[PDB]
Amino acid sequence: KYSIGLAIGTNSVGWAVITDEYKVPSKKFKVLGNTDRHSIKKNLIGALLFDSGETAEATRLKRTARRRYTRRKNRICYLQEIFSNEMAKVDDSFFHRLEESFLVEEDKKHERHPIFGNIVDEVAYHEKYPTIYHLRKKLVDSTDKADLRLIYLALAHMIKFRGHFLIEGDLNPDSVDKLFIQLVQTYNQLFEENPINASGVDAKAILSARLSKSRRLENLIAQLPGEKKNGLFGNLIALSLGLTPNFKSNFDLAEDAKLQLSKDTYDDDLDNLLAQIGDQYADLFLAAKNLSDAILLSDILRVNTEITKAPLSASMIKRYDEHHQDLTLLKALVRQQLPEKYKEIFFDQSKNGYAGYIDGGASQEEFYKFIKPILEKMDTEELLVKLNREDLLRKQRTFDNGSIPHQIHLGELHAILRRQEDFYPFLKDNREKIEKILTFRIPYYVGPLARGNSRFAWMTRKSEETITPWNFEEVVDKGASAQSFIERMTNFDKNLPNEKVLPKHSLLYEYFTVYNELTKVKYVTEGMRKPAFLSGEQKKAIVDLLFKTNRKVTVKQLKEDYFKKIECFDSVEISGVEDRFNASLGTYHDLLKIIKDKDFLDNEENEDILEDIVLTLTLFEDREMIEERLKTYAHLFDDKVMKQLKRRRYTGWGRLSRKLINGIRDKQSGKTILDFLKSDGFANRNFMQLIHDDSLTFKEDIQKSLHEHIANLAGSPAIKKGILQTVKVVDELVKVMGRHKPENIVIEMARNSRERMKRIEEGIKELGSQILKEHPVENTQLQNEKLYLYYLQNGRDMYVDQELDINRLSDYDVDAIVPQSFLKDDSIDNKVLTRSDKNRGKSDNVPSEEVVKKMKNYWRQLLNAKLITQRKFDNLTKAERGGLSELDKAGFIKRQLVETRQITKHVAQILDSRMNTKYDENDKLIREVKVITLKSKLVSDFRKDFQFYKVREINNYHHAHDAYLNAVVGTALIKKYPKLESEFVYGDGKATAKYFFYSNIMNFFKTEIKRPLIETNGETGEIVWDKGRDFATVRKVLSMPQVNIVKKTEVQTGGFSKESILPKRNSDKLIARKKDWDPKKYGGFVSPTVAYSVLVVAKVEKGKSKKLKSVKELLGITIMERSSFEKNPIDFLEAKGYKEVKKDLIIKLPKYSLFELENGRKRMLASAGELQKGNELALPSKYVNFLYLASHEQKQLFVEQHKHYLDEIIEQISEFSKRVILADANLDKVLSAYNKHRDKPIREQAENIIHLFTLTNLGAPAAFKYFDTTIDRKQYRSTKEVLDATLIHQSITGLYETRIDLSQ
RNA sequence: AUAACUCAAUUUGUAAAAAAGUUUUAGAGCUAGAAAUAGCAAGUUAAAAUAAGGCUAGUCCGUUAUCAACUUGAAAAAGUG
DNA sequence: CAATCTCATTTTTTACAAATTGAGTTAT
DNA sequence: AAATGAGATTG
Ligand SMILES: [K+]
Ligand SMILES: [K+]
Ligand SMILES: [K+]
Ligand SMILES: [K+]
Ligand SMILES: [K+]
Ligand SMILES: [K+]
Ligand SMILES: [K+]
Ligand SMILES: [K+]
Ligand SMILES: [K+]
Ligand SMILES: [K+]
Ligand SMILES: [K+]
Ligand SMILES: [K+]
Ligand SMILES: [K+]
Ligand SMILES: [Mg+2]
Ligand SMILES: [Mg+2]
Structure with missing residues (x-):
C-alpha cells in the first residue's frame, strides 16, 4: 500500500508516506483534551525539528576542572594539618582568619586583618613585602628564624600555584655562556681543520634576549665570521633554540634529517641520523640539548643565580x-x-x-x-x-606564567624548608611530606581515586587505607590500574572474543604480517611456464636474508639480493607486491640495535620472553613501571641494555590475538595459522583462506537496546540524535498505518581559525619561510579560503612554480585537484590556489604530467611541512600513474549517487532489522520491507531538472518535501531497474559503459534528452512512471499548504546560569554563590536557565493585609531548582508564595511548548518569560520557484513576465505578519524598505526578499538586512497571553494531538 | 559488500595537569573645606570561592546522552486514536 | 509598557583507545 | 561560534 520517505539531518528528520501512484494520504486523527475539536485532518507528510545533540566534551572539561579544584583544596588542607599544632601556639585564629578572609567585616568572627590580626603589623608586612615573591625570596635567602605564619603563607603559595609537570626529573637552575662555550668546544674537537672562535661573543645576551628564535640565531652567527646560519654550527644553535633544522645537507644525506627537540621522537631521530654519520657526533647533539635547556630557562629566570637561590x-x-x-x-x-x-x-x-x-x-x-x-x-x-x-x-x-615548571617552585619550597627546619622541628620531620604535597600527581593511567561510586573510575586498591600523596604507592595498585586503563579500551579479538589482541609491534604479530603478505607473492622467469608461489624454504630464505637484515624490503632488493644471488636469475617478474613490502619486522631491528644479540632474537625458546617485553613496552608508558616489569629479565642483558630497553616504548594494538595466530592448531595438520603462512605446500593460503577453509578446522574452532546501540555507533552525537529520532518516527508511522509495514523505506542523510594559524605557523617554520614576518596574519583573516591556501602554499603558485601576490588574490583561482565533476569535495584537501586554472592542464583529469614534473619537488616540501596532506599529494601527482583511468571516472560517478558512508549503512541496518523479523523455510531472512539509501544528489538534480525548486529560508517544509521526493525517486528507481537493488537496497570498454550508465541513470524521468510518455519495467511490464500525471501529483504534494512541522519539546539542561560573577548590587536577580553569601554583600550569578515552566493555579498574598488573591501564572523552574521542585512540588511552590495550589492542574511545559491563540496564531515557549513564533508561512509554490529562478534562458523570460510576483510575495508576507507575527514597527520598516528599492535589479530584489522571511520564520526572532536596512528583532517577552490560550501537546509526528483550552 | 596489512587524515570517548579571569575582604590615603567637592598621593600582592550543592563520605559525584499527552511503570518502555 | 542596547569565562600541556575515510597489497 | 534568552537603560 505505502512507502516511507525519510530525510535525516542534524536538526531535522523529514518524513513522508506515499501510495502506489506517489500520492501522500490524508487521514482524520482523533484530538483529545477539553476543547471543541474532536478530530483533525492531517496530511501524512511532515518534519521534526530539534536542537543539536551536543558532544560530551564541555561536560568533560567541567568535570575534570572540578576535580582539579577539590584536589588543590586538599593540598592546602594537608599543609594546614601539618602546621596545626604548632600554629595553635603562635596564633590561635590564624587559619580561621584565612578561611573567612572573603567575608565582610560584619560577618567575620575574628579581626579583619588576615595575617597578623592587627593593622600595624599587617601594614608593616605589606610595606616590607609588597608582593608574595618578596617574602619568598627573603625566606629562601635569609638565615633568620621566621614567623611561622609567613613560612606557611609562602609554602601555601608555592603549593597552590605549583606550575606544570611537562619536564621529567629535576632542574637545578642554570648561570648559557658556559654551555655555549661547551658547544663550541666539542664542535672544535670534532672539526680540527676549521675551528670557530669564541671570540668574546656574548652568548648569554644574544640567546636569552627577548626576540624570536630565528633572530637570536641570526644575531649569534653574525658574531661568528664566515659561519652561515645553514652551516652545521648554525643548525646546532637553531636546534638548541627549540627550532627544527635539517642536518642532511651538512652530512651529505639523501634522506631528510630534521631534529625538533620537543618531539618525543628526538632520541630516535638522533639514533638513526647518528647511525649514518657516525657516533663521534653524539657529543655535539647532546651539547645542543643542554644549551636548549638553559635557553628555555632563560625565558623565566632573568636573573643571575649567584645572588639568590630563588x-x-x-x-x-x-x-x-x-x-x-x-x-x-x-x-x-x-x-x-x-x-x-x-x-x-x-x-x-x-x-x-x-x-x-x-x-x-x-x-x-x-x-x-x-x-x-x-x-x-x-x-x-x-x-x-x-x-x-x-x-x-x-x-x-x-x-604567560604557564611556562613555569613545578621544579622551580619546588626549589624555593625546599630552600625554605631547609632554612626554617633548623628553628622548627616539625618542619624537619615533615619536610618530605610537604615537598611531596607539591610534587605528587595522580597518574593519568590511575584515574579518579574512587570507592565504587564513580562511573569514570577504573583504579584498583592494594589496601583499604584512605589514599594520600604519601601512601599512594603502597595503597594504590599502580600496575593493575595502568593495565586497566588500556585494557578497558582495547579490542578483544573478534575471532576469539575472549582473547586479548596482540601489541601492534609484537614480534609474532610482525612475523604474521610479513608472512601473510609474502605468501601471495608470485614470480616468473624466462624458463618457467607459469608464475609460482614461494615455497616455505624460499620464504624462510627471504626472511632471514632480507627482512632480518634490511628494515624495509623493496622489490628491487627481492630481485637482486634474492633471485639473482641465490637463484641466479638475471630477470624475474614479481606479481604480489608493489615497489616494497608493506609489512616489515621493525621491532626485530629495534631490539637488534638494543640487545645486540641476533642469536637471542632468532631462538624460538626466547619467543615468550620477547613477547612479554614488548607487551610491557606497549602496555605502560611510565619508565619506572616499565623497569619494574623488566627486572625479571635483568639477568639476561647487561645493565646498559636494560637502560636502553627501558627507553624503548611502543603504542597501538593489532586486530588479532596470539592464540589465533600461533595458538590454535588444525586437527589434521597440527599446524597453527602461522605454520601455514610459513609453509602451505602448493597452495599458499592466506589468513582469510585459512579462516574460511572447510577442509581445515580453524573455521569451526572460531565459530564458537536500540538506544545503547545507536549511542555506540561511531559518528557525531549530532547525527545520532537524528538517527534515534528517525526510528521513533518510523515506529509512529507504522502505527498510524494500522501496524502494516511499508513496502519500501527510503533514507537520505545530510553530509577553526586557531587550528589554521597553528598549521601555518608550524609548516612555515619548518619550511624556514619569512612570509609570516613579511606578511603578518591574524587567525580570523584565515577564514578566507584564498588567503588560507595562500599561506599553505608559502606564497607560491601551486602549479606554476612562481610567486603569488597577497594583494592580487581576487584575480586568482581556487581549482579542484581532481575535478568537481567527478568528486564533490569542498575541502582544502581537493583545493589549490593558482593564478589561473588553465595552467593545471586538461580540464577532464588530474593535473597534467607537465605540471607534476615541474611541481613535484615543491609539493614534497609542502607535504613534509604538512601544509598539504598525503591524500592531496597523491591526487596531485596521479598523472604520473596515468591520472584518472576511465574506470576511476565511472567509480566517481556512481559514488555520487550510491551511498558508501558507514553511518548511513548502520541506519539502514537498524531499520531493516526492526522491520524484517521472519525467516523462510531455508532459515533465510524474509525481506518484506526494502530499505533504500540514496545520496542527496538524486533528489537535488531531480528538483533542478523538473523545476521543483527549494528555498530553505521560506519555511521548514523543504525537509519534508525532500523526504517525499526521496520516497518517490527511490521507489521509481528500483521499480525501473530492479537489478540495482544490489547497490541501493540493504542486505545480501566496460568502464565507459558504467560511466555512461550511472551518468544517465535518471533519464527515464525525461521525455526528451526521446522516450515514451509512460515508462515501464520491461520484465514485468509494470508502470513505474507516467510523465503525464505523476509529475502533476508531485507538484500537488509540494503545493499542499498543511505540513506537519514539529519542534521537539525539550527540558533544558546544563549550566545553572551564566558563569560570570557580577559585583554586589541590590537585585533579587543576583544568585548567591554559596548558601550564606548574600549577593547584596558578595555579588553573585545572573540569568539562570529555565529547565521547564510550570502552570500554577493558586492564591498569593496581597498587600500588608495578605489578602489571598487567585492567580494563574507561569513559573520558570530553574535547572538549579529542578530537583527541589520535583522532590516535593507543593512545598516548593508554597515556599515561592503560592497557596491553595491546585495540585492536579500543574502542567509541565518544557521549552518550545506550543500554544494556539486567535486567528490560528501560534506561539512556542522560549522560557517562562519569553515566546517564539509558532507559525509556518506556507508560500505558494509559484512564488517559491519564481524566487529561486529570480535570485539566480526561458526561465529568465518567465521571471520578467512574472515580475508582479514581487508585490504578490510582499502581500503574502505582510498578510501573514499582520495575522501572526504582530510586529508592526518592523513590518512597516520592511514595507518602507521594499518600496525604496524597487528601482533595483530583479535578481537583487529577489535575494533580499528572501532575507525578509526570517521575519516570518518559526522559532526565535532574529535580525535581518533587507538591502542596507537592518531590522532589529522583535522578541516576545511576555507569556501572559498564553495562560488563556489553547496548549497543544503533540506526538513525534504531530499527527496525534491533545489540546487543552487553558481556562481554569 | 566483508577480513588482515601499509600510509595519512578525521572524528568520538576518557584521564591527569597548568596559567589567567572574576568576585568579597586585607594592603592605616593625605591635606584643606561644614557639604558635596577639590588638589595631590597610590596602584603590581594575597586569602577564599569557582557551578547552589549531594550522600554513597570517595583526595567521589554534580553541565553529555535520553523526554508530548493520558492510562501503567520506580525505568526503560509498555497500553490508547 | 515597549523600544533599544548590551551581554555572554579564557587559554595551555600531557597520556590513551576506538571508528571512519581513502589511497594501496592480498584474500572470501 | 553565533545565537538567543535576558539584564539594563531609556521612551
Ligand atoms: K565582627
Ligand atoms: K659569520
Ligand atoms: K607497497
Ligand atoms: K606504551
Ligand atoms: K645483567
Ligand atoms: K540534554
Ligand atoms: K542543549
Ligand atoms: K582527541
Ligand atoms: K590577579
Ligand atoms: K585589568
Ligand atoms: K578587575
Ligand atoms: K512532542
Ligand atoms: K543564550
Ligand atoms: Mg567545590
Ligand atoms: Mg588571581
Missing part, C-alpha cells in the same frame, strides 16, 4: 621594581608634557589606561595598545623598548 621570585621582584621605576617616570612625563590627559590615564577605570589596567577590566595587551600612541608622541624611548619586549609595566600574576 631566581623566579627574584625575577618577579624585578618585574615589580621596573614597574615602580617606570611608573614614577611615566607619571612625571605625563605631568610635564600632557597634564590634560593625566586624569583619563591614572583615574578613569573605563579607559584602558593605567587605571583601567590596575582597577579595571583592561588586559596587558589592551593597556599597551592604549598607551603606545601616548608614549611615542611624547619625549620615553626606553618605555617603548619595554613595550615591544612586552616588558613595560608587568604584574607578577600573568597569562
Whole structure:
C-alpha cells in the first residue's frame, strides 16, 4: 500500500508516506483534551525539528576542572594539618582568619586583618613585602628564624600555584655562556681543520634576549665570521633554540634529517641520523640539548643565580621594581608634557589606561595598545623598548606564567624548608611530606581515586587505607590500574572474543604480517611456464636474508639480493607486491640495535620472553613501571641494555590475538595459522583462506537496546540524535498505518581559525619561510579560503612554480585537484590556489604530467611541512600513474549517487532489522520491507531538472518535501531497474559503459534528452512512471499548504546560569554563590536557565493585609531548582508564595511548548518569560520557484513576465505578519524598505526578499538586512497571553494531538 | 559488500595537569573645606570561592546522552486514536 | 509598557583507545 | 561560534 520517505539531518528528520501512484494520504486523527475539536485532518507528510545533540566534551572539561579544584583544596588542607599544632601556639585564629578572609567585616568572627590580626603589623608586612615573591625570596635567602605564619603563607603559595609537570626529573637552575662555550668546544674537537672562535661573543645576551628564535640565531652567527646560519654550527644553535633544522645537507644525506627537540621522537631521530654519520657526533647533539635547556630557562629566570637561590621570585621582584621605576617616570612625563590627559590615564577605570589596567577590566595587551600612541608622541624611548619586549609595566600574576615548571617552585619550597627546619622541628620531620604535597600527581593511567561510586573510575586498591600523596604507592595498585586503563579500551579479538589482541609491534604479530603478505607473492622467469608461489624454504630464505637484515624490503632488493644471488636469475617478474613490502619486522631491528644479540632474537625458546617485553613496552608508558616489569629479565642483558630497553616504548594494538595466530592448531595438520603462512605446500593460503577453509578446522574452532546501540555507533552525537529520532518516527508511522509495514523505506542523510594559524605557523617554520614576518596574519583573516591556501602554499603558485601576490588574490583561482565533476569535495584537501586554472592542464583529469614534473619537488616540501596532506599529494601527482583511468571516472560517478558512508549503512541496518523479523523455510531472512539509501544528489538534480525548486529560508517544509521526493525517486528507481537493488537496497570498454550508465541513470524521468510518455519495467511490464500525471501529483504534494512541522519539546539542561560573577548590587536577580553569601554583600550569578515552566493555579498574598488573591501564572523552574521542585512540588511552590495550589492542574511545559491563540496564531515557549513564533508561512509554490529562478534562458523570460510576483510575495508576507507575527514597527520598516528599492535589479530584489522571511520564520526572532536596512528583532517577552490560550501537546509526528483550552 | 596489512587524515570517548579571569575582604590615603567637592598621593600582592550543592563520605559525584499527552511503570518502555 | 542596547569565562600541556575515510597489497 | 534568552537603560 505505502512507502516511507525519510530525510535525516542534524536538526531535522523529514518524513513522508506515499501510495502506489506517489500520492501522500490524508487521514482524520482523533484530538483529545477539553476543547471543541474532536478530530483533525492531517496530511501524512511532515518534519521534526530539534536542537543539536551536543558532544560530551564541555561536560568533560567541567568535570575534570572540578576535580582539579577539590584536589588543590586538599593540598592546602594537608599543609594546614601539618602546621596545626604548632600554629595553635603562635596564633590561635590564624587559619580561621584565612578561611573567612572573603567575608565582610560584619560577618567575620575574628579581626579583619588576615595575617597578623592587627593593622600595624599587617601594614608593616605589606610595606616590607609588597608582593608574595618578596617574602619568598627573603625566606629562601635569609638565615633568620621566621614567623611561622609567613613560612606557611609562602609554602601555601608555592603549593597552590605549583606550575606544570611537562619536564621529567629535576632542574637545578642554570648561570648559557658556559654551555655555549661547551658547544663550541666539542664542535672544535670534532672539526680540527676549521675551528670557530669564541671570540668574546656574548652568548648569554644574544640567546636569552627577548626576540624570536630565528633572530637570536641570526644575531649569534653574525658574531661568528664566515659561519652561515645553514652551516652545521648554525643548525646546532637553531636546534638548541627549540627550532627544527635539517642536518642532511651538512652530512651529505639523501634522506631528510630534521631534529625538533620537543618531539618525543628526538632520541630516535638522533639514533638513526647518528647511525649514518657516525657516533663521534653524539657529543655535539647532546651539547645542543643542554644549551636548549638553559635557553628555555632563560625565558623565566632573568636573573643571575649567584645572588639568590630563588631566581623566579627574584625575577618577579624585578618585574615589580621596573614597574615602580617606570611608573614614577611615566607619571612625571605625563605631568610635564600632557597634564590634560593625566586624569583619563591614572583615574578613569573605563579607559584602558593605567587605571583601567590596575582597577579595571583592561588586559596587558589592551593597556599597551592604549598607551603606545601616548608614549611615542611624547619625549620615553626606553618605555617603548619595554613595550615591544612586552616588558613595560608587568604584574607578577600573568597569562604567560604557564611556562613555569613545578621544579622551580619546588626549589624555593625546599630552600625554605631547609632554612626554617633548623628553628622548627616539625618542619624537619615533615619536610618530605610537604615537598611531596607539591610534587605528587595522580597518574593519568590511575584515574579518579574512587570507592565504587564513580562511573569514570577504573583504579584498583592494594589496601583499604584512605589514599594520600604519601601512601599512594603502597595503597594504590599502580600496575593493575595502568593495565586497566588500556585494557578497558582495547579490542578483544573478534575471532576469539575472549582473547586479548596482540601489541601492534609484537614480534609474532610482525612475523604474521610479513608472512601473510609474502605468501601471495608470485614470480616468473624466462624458463618457467607459469608464475609460482614461494615455497616455505624460499620464504624462510627471504626472511632471514632480507627482512632480518634490511628494515624495509623493496622489490628491487627481492630481485637482486634474492633471485639473482641465490637463484641466479638475471630477470624475474614479481606479481604480489608493489615497489616494497608493506609489512616489515621493525621491532626485530629495534631490539637488534638494543640487545645486540641476533642469536637471542632468532631462538624460538626466547619467543615468550620477547613477547612479554614488548607487551610491557606497549602496555605502560611510565619508565619506572616499565623497569619494574623488566627486572625479571635483568639477568639476561647487561645493565646498559636494560637502560636502553627501558627507553624503548611502543603504542597501538593489532586486530588479532596470539592464540589465533600461533595458538590454535588444525586437527589434521597440527599446524597453527602461522605454520601455514610459513609453509602451505602448493597452495599458499592466506589468513582469510585459512579462516574460511572447510577442509581445515580453524573455521569451526572460531565459530564458537536500540538506544545503547545507536549511542555506540561511531559518528557525531549530532547525527545520532537524528538517527534515534528517525526510528521513533518510523515506529509512529507504522502505527498510524494500522501496524502494516511499508513496502519500501527510503533514507537520505545530510553530509577553526586557531587550528589554521597553528598549521601555518608550524609548516612555515619548518619550511624556514619569512612570509609570516613579511606578511603578518591574524587567525580570523584565515577564514578566507584564498588567503588560507595562500599561506599553505608559502606564497607560491601551486602549479606554476612562481610567486603569488597577497594583494592580487581576487584575480586568482581556487581549482579542484581532481575535478568537481567527478568528486564533490569542498575541502582544502581537493583545493589549490593558482593564478589561473588553465595552467593545471586538461580540464577532464588530474593535473597534467607537465605540471607534476615541474611541481613535484615543491609539493614534497609542502607535504613534509604538512601544509598539504598525503591524500592531496597523491591526487596531485596521479598523472604520473596515468591520472584518472576511465574506470576511476565511472567509480566517481556512481559514488555520487550510491551511498558508501558507514553511518548511513548502520541506519539502514537498524531499520531493516526492526522491520524484517521472519525467516523462510531455508532459515533465510524474509525481506518484506526494502530499505533504500540514496545520496542527496538524486533528489537535488531531480528538483533542478523538473523545476521543483527549494528555498530553505521560506519555511521548514523543504525537509519534508525532500523526504517525499526521496520516497518517490527511490521507489521509481528500483521499480525501473530492479537489478540495482544490489547497490541501493540493504542486505545480501566496460568502464565507459558504467560511466555512461550511472551518468544517465535518471533519464527515464525525461521525455526528451526521446522516450515514451509512460515508462515501464520491461520484465514485468509494470508502470513505474507516467510523465503525464505523476509529475502533476508531485507538484500537488509540494503545493499542499498543511505540513506537519514539529519542534521537539525539550527540558533544558546544563549550566545553572551564566558563569560570570557580577559585583554586589541590590537585585533579587543576583544568585548567591554559596548558601550564606548574600549577593547584596558578595555579588553573585545572573540569568539562570529555565529547565521547564510550570502552570500554577493558586492564591498569593496581597498587600500588608495578605489578602489571598487567585492567580494563574507561569513559573520558570530553574535547572538549579529542578530537583527541589520535583522532590516535593507543593512545598516548593508554597515556599515561592503560592497557596491553595491546585495540585492536579500543574502542567509541565518544557521549552518550545506550543500554544494556539486567535486567528490560528501560534506561539512556542522560549522560557517562562519569553515566546517564539509558532507559525509556518506556507508560500505558494509559484512564488517559491519564481524566487529561486529570480535570485539566480526561458526561465529568465518567465521571471520578467512574472515580475508582479514581487508585490504578490510582499502581500503574502505582510498578510501573514499582520495575522501572526504582530510586529508592526518592523513590518512597516520592511514595507518602507521594499518600496525604496524597487528601482533595483530583479535578481537583487529577489535575494533580499528572501532575507525578509526570517521575519516570518518559526522559532526565535532574529535580525535581518533587507538591502542596507537592518531590522532589529522583535522578541516576545511576555507569556501572559498564553495562560488563556489553547496548549497543544503533540506526538513525534504531530499527527496525534491533545489540546487543552487553558481556562481554569 | 566483508577480513588482515601499509600510509595519512578525521572524528568520538576518557584521564591527569597548568596559567589567567572574576568576585568579597586585607594592603592605616593625605591635606584643606561644614557639604558635596577639590588638589595631590597610590596602584603590581594575597586569602577564599569557582557551578547552589549531594550522600554513597570517595583526595567521589554534580553541565553529555535520553523526554508530548493520558492510562501503567520506580525505568526503560509498555497500553490508547 | 515597549523600544533599544548590551551581554555572554579564557587559554595551555600531557597520556590513551576506538571508528571512519581513502589511497594501496592480498584474500572470501 | 553565533545565537538567543535576558539584564539594563531609556521612551
Ligand atoms: K565582627
Ligand atoms: K659569520
Ligand atoms: K578587575
Ligand atoms: K585589568
Ligand atoms: K590577579
Ligand atoms: K607497497
Ligand atoms: K606504551
Ligand atoms: K645483567
Ligand atoms: K540534554
Ligand atoms: K542543549
Ligand atoms: K582527541
Ligand atoms: K512532542
Ligand atoms: K543564550
Ligand atoms: Mg567545590
Ligand atoms: Mg588571581
